[PDB]
Amino acid sequence: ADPEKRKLIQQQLVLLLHAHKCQRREQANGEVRACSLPHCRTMKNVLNHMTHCQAGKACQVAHCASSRQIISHWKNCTRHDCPVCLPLKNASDKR
């Protein structure tokens, strides 16, 4: 393992969540684009692929192989404090 690979994984996790958050929000209620992050469209394409594809371990695509893993982690993770899971589960900012 490497700390900079963890940095890369952290942003992939957040971006993948944005892709669906953006989609969901836009469909539910919008006027001005829900989107903010440039890479969102890339993650939306990856998101679409993930649901259709069933190869997982065998899929040669970097994105597919990675994206399944990040969601698997977040879903299973019930740790006291994790650098992504914790802030996602319990958002520090509230209204």
Binding site: I9, R24, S72
Partner: protein
């Protein structure tokens, strides 16, 4: 802006989007309990819980 998105710039600075793999991700951040691959409908259901 958004809570999850807090200083994305930190990691975004490194090229843009990396070429990570199942192996790399499994090694660096192991799935709690036992390793698996969350797939199909369950993906979208997991992504929905953010709201």
């Amino acid at each position: 802006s958004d809570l999850a998105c807090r200083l994305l710039g930190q990691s975004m600075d490194e090229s843009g989007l990396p070429q990570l793999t199942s192996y790399d991700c499994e090694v660096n951040a192991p799935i709690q309990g036992s390793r698996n691959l969350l797939q199909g409908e369950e993906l979208l259901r997991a992504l929905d819980q953010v709201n």
